[PDB]
Design a protein around this ligand. Structure first.
Ligand SMILES: [Zn+2]
Ligand SMILES: [Zn+2]
Lengths: 153, 153
């Protein structure tokens, strides 16, 4: 696949549509779209391991981290495959997403099709929050909305 | 063995969890779980091409049919990859699913991870309905509920 899409929903008002496009299988993945219903400010934006929503967002499990690294920000050498940093919500709760990543893929081992995209309660501290939880989830807190990443037309 | 799962939801009361499991890459896929909120009787149970829920179940598109064949029942040589036939709902609206299929896969060209599982309004006529539409969708009608097939623990 060269295109993917994720519909984000949760227990509250957080909702959105996130697009994915990868023209070359060894090139970067463009990640774009919008999320509404967030509090103003920074929110962690991660690919979690499982495309399992049986129990809500919790069933998606830990961060997608097949190379077993500690948590970092997208520009860090050391980070999970699923570490896409933070998205930024405006005063109206709207976060416009426009990201380009070369670690995630729409194919092969780093393939995220069938996994889960999650927008978190708080800002992802990129591994520099200065405690143990920081080197794991970036202290991004709870799962506000999620969706299984699906093959798109 | 790779494992997958799908949460079925729609506009109405149809809801269900469907599990997928495949021990070997050339093995058959066990699929099983339950669906409630269905009218008593038969319901088409099909894998559609896209894991895109942006406009509901409609956006999943057509049947997963990469070999461009005519629609049939699961046992038929002539069938869509996505042709899993029908499920049966009892008098309390509950459809227990337990299927084994060797055309679908959780890997390769027939992989369904990231595609959409759909439970339909009417019975799938397995291409034995005697009309043009029978040979395309089995006249299963409406999409009651769907979910993207995601990777599972
Ligand atoms: Zn991480
Ligand atoms: Zn079909």
């Amino acid at each position: 696949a060269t295109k993917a899409v994720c519909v984000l929903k949760g227990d509250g008002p957080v909702q959105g549509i996130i697009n994915f496009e990868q023209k070359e299988s060894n090139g970067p993945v463009k990640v774009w779209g919008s999320i509404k219903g967030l509090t103003e400010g920074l929110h962690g934006f991660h690919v979690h391991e499982f495309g399992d929503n049986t129990a809500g967002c919790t069933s998606a499990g830990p961060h997608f981290n097949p190379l077993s690294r500690k948590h970092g920000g997208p520009k860090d050498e050391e980070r999970h495959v699923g570490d896409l940093g933070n998205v930024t919500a405006d005063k109206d709760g709207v976060a416009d997403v426009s990201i380009e990543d070369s670690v995630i893929s729409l194919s092969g081992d780093h393939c995220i099709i069938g996994r889960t995209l999650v927008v978190h309660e708080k800002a992802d501290d990129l591994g520099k929050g200065g405690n143990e939880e920081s080197t794991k989830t970036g202290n991004a807190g709870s799962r506000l909305a999620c969706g299984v990443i699906g093959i798109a037309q």
